Each structure stands twice: as C-alpha cells, then as structure tokens.
C-alpha cells in the first residue's frame, strides 16, 4: 500500500536476548536488574553467549526459591545494576555458570569478593573438563 | 549459616509473564512496548492466558518479517504503550488472536478503529466454531 489516506506498515524486529550474567527479578516489590558478581559470560551474539543466557534462564525460572545476596562492597554499579550473588534453590547461579564453563571469573574487586575462591574452584574444574569456553 | 556479620540472603521472585496482547519489539532503533489495538486477551494467570501468550509469541518470534501499523488517533496509551496493529509475514496478530478465540474485540474507539470490521468478522467465526474462550 502507498495511499497517504490509509494506514502505513513499518518494520520492526525482536529485541536482542539479555546476556547470561544479567538477571532481572522482582525484588522488594519492584523490578530490578542485577549483574552477577565475580563472573563474565560472553555476550549473546558471541559463541557460548546463547548457552549462558539459556543456562541462567533455566536455573532461575525453574527455581522454587530465588534469593539475592549482596557483598560487603558497592551494592550497585555505575549502570544502576544490583551487584549480587543470586541463588536458585540454594545453588548459586554465579558459581554454576562458571562450573559449566559459561562464564570466566572476572571483576574481582576489594570488598565484593567473598565467594572468590569458591568460584575459582568451579573455574579450575570447568577448565580441567574443557567445558564450553574452555573447549 | 547464622553469623550476622557476613552476608545475608534476601527473597526475590520472577517478573510476571507478559500478557498475550502486549508485545515488545525493536522499533526505529529502540525497544518499545506495544499494546495490540482492538483486542483483549485473558491475563496470563486466567484460563487461556498462557495459550494467548504462546500463540502471539509463536506468531511473532517465528516471523520472517514483523511490521507495526499505528491507527489515526492516539499513538500511545496512558501506560506509554504504542497502540498498533502488528503483522507477522503479512498476517495480523490482532486478527489472528481473535480468530482463534484467544482474545475478544474490545477498546474500540472511533478514530483508532480502522480494522474494526475485520476483527469483528474474525470474532463471529471464533464464536461460531466455539473456539477456546467461546467453548
Ligand atoms: C560485575 C561488575 C561489573 N562492573 C562494570 C564493569 C564494566 O563497566 P565499564 O565497561 O564501564 O568499565 C561493566 C561490565 O559489565 P557487563 O559484562 O555486563 O558489560 O560493569 C562493575 O563495575 N562491577 C562489577 O562487579
Ligand atoms: C487497547 C487499549 C487499551 N487502553 C487502556 C484501557 C485500560 O486502561 P484502564 O483500565 O486504566 O482504563 C488498559 C487495558 O489494557 P490491558 O488489557 O493491557 O490491561 O489500557 C487504551 O487506553 N486504549 C487502547 O486502545
């Protein structure tokens, strides 16, 4: 159609999927974006990115109980994301992503590194097993 | 497990699923939430809710080409949602929901009702076939 007297169709596309280490939840009555402490997944458009997103999604959305755990240091990054460890039925999403070789340990800063050694242990095991990013 | 001097876990929940007649898209370079003109699906937690949402998601997310089409009146509602007809490979999502008895024709206001007669014809057939909402 071209008539200026009628309606006009315009293109649209799908919004890009969220990366695996960004976790959006309902917290204290408000939607909130968390960035997982101590980890770095590939972005969705790079190799293992879709796998990291799908793994986080599966863990979080299948959970009976989700919890949020801030560390001792800064609570929010400069982008206004909550900096947390996130748990699904008692299993830490941050640790699981690293154990699966879907994220590397990263962003290890003073005061916000309580679970550092637990995560490095997961990474060493993922690497020993040549999983995903380590393959 | 008990020390109050270390970290604390807090509860969080999933953000509730979007209803079938809300659609989020990338449009002219930005994310935008649309509300489908002329239709009303059940909410996700009511009967046929999940079906309406799955039907829309399948239609939109499998499309080769998605289009949006504003009417002549109000472009956004009071919630900031774009009021549009949405097309998936040339088939209108608004019309299709109604045709399958997953939405009723509603919110029909003079000036934003270009496709009224189309949608009411779809509803009559859905009702005739006793489909879904009409069963
Ligand atoms: C995980 C984490 C990220 N960030 C910041 C560092 C990067 O911002 P800058 O690029 O401006 O330096 C960004 C990486 O997160 P993403 O991997 O989500 O993009 O988030 C922190 O500041 N603290 C943290 O604990
Ligand atoms: C479809 C549509 C809805 N709306 C408003 C009417 C309802 O708001 P109010 O109840 O506050 O009056 C609401 C229904 O949308 P939902 O079915 O998504 O909830 O959106 C419009 O204003 N114009 C429209 O064309």
Please give the Cα distance from A114 to B17 (Å, whole number): 33
Phi and psi at residue A38, to the nearest 5°: 75, 15
Distance in Å from the first CA to the final CA of chain B: 53
Q: For chain A, how many structural domains are there in total?
A: 1
**Where is B43: in which H helix or E strand?**
none
B81 ligand 2 Cβ < 6 A: no
Three-state SS annotation for chain A: CCCCCCCCCEEEECCCCCCCCEEEEEECCEEEEEEECCEECCCCCCCCHHHHHHHHHHHHHHCCCEEEEECCCCCECCCCCEEEEEEECCEEHHHHHHHCCCCEECCCCCCCCCCHHHHHHHHHHHHHCCCHHHC
Contacts of A39 (CB under 8 A, 6+ apart): A21, A94, A97, A98, A103, A104, A105, A106, A107, A119
Please give the Cα distance from B61 to A16 (Å, whole number): 12
Residues of A in contact with B69 (CB under 8 A): 7-10
Q: Does A44 touch chain B (CB under 8 A)?
A: no
Which tokens in the block code for residue A46?
A: 């790079």
Q: How far is the CA of A78 from the centre of ligand 1 (A)?
A: 8
Question: Of B81, B95, B99, B123, which is the active-site residue?
Answer: B81
Phi and psi at residue B102, to the nearest 5°: -105, 0
Which tokens in the block code for residue A60?
A: 């979080």
Q: Give one word for B28, left, alpha or beta, with left for phi > 0 and alpha for psi -120 to 50.
A: left
Q: Does B116 touch chain A (CB under 8 A)?
A: no
Please give the Cα distance from A109 to A116 (Å, whole number): 10
What is the widest separation between alpha-carbon atoms in chain A?
67
Please give the Cα distance from B2 to B17 (Å, whole number): 35
Q: How far is the CA of A35 from the centre of ligand 2 (A)?
A: 33
A21 annotated as belonging to a binding site for a ligand: yes
How many CB atoms sit inside 10 A of residue B10's CB? 12
Nearest one of A85, A79, A70, A73 to A37, comparing CA atoms: A85
Residues facing A15 on adjacent strands: none
Question: What residues of B form the annotated binding site for Ca(2+)?
Answer: 21, 40-41
Which position has the token pair 């097309």? B87
Query: What range defines the domain where residue B15 resides?
Result: 1-135
Q: Domain holding B125: CATH number?
A: 2.40.50.90
Please give the Cα distance from B59 to B87 (Å, whole number): 9
Residues facing B32 on adjacent strands: B25
| PDB experimental method | X-ray
By the 10 Å C-beta count (0-12 exposed, 13-18 middle, 19+ buried), B117 is classed as exposed
CA of B16 vs chain A CAs: smallest distance (Å): 8
Reported residue count of chain B is 135
How many CB atoms sit inside 10 A of residue A123's CB? 21
How many CB atoms sit inside 10 A of residue B118's CB? 17
CA of A98 vs chain B CAs: smallest distance (Å): 20
Check A65 against B11: CB less than 8 A apart. Answer: yes
Q: Which of ligand 2's atoms lies nearest the C-alpha of B41?
A: 17
Identify the DSSP state of B99.
H
Please give the Cα distance from B57 to B51 (Å, whole number): 10
Resolution of the experimental structure, in angstroms: 1.8
For the question of residue B116 being annotated catalytic, the response is no
């Amino acid at each position: 159609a071209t008539s200026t007297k009628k309606l006009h169709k315009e293109p649209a596309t799908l919004i890009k999927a969220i990366d695996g280490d960004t976790v959006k939840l309902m917290y204290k009555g408000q939607p909130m974006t968390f960035r997982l402490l101590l980890v770095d997944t590939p972005e969705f458009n790079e190799k293992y990115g879709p796998e990291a997103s799908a793994f986080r999604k599966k863990m979080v959305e299948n959970a009976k109980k989700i919890e949020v755990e801030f560390d001792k240091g800064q609570r929010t990054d400069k982008y206004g994301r909550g900096l947390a460890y996130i748990y699904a039925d008692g299993k830490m999403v941050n640790e699981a992503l690293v154990r699966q070789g879907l994220a590397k340990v990263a962003y290890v800063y003073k005061g916000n590194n309580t679970h550092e050694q637990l995560l490095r242990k997961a990474e060493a095991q993922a690497k020993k097993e040549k999983l995903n990013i380590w393959s």
